[PDB]
Amino acid sequence: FAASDPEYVDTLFREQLLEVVMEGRELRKVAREASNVINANTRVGDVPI
Amino acid sequence: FAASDPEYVDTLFREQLLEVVMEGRELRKVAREASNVINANTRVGDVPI
Ligand SMILES: [Mg+2]
Ligand SMILES: [Mg+2]
């Protein structure tokens, strides 16, 4: 009837797609706080104890 | 023979190569003048009528 969005839902405009994508399951990021972090200069090395 | 150009055609001189490359078949290109060009934001779309 008249002109309503249920008729022209793909004709006069598009349904919004939100610019934000909502996350999947996110696993808990802790390691950087939960341990001492060493920025190594080498892939292999040893720490003195 | 004595000294003839078909003997020394690749030894005393080199055959002429004409500097103009001759064009092949050129098709008639008109669509851009002969229609309305829509620069689209998507591959698949719709136009309202
Ligand atoms: Mg070691
Ligand atoms: Mg469509």
UniProtKB/TrEMBL annotation, chains A, B:
Coiled-coil segments on the chain, per record: none
Top-rank taxon: Viruses
Binding-site residues, Mg(2+) 1: E15, D46
Signal sequence range: none
Name used for this protein in its record: HK97 gp5-like major capsid protein
Taxonomic lineage of the native organism: Viruses, Duplodnaviria, Heunggongvirae, Uroviricota, Caudoviricetes
Region of the whole protein represented: 101 to 149 of 396
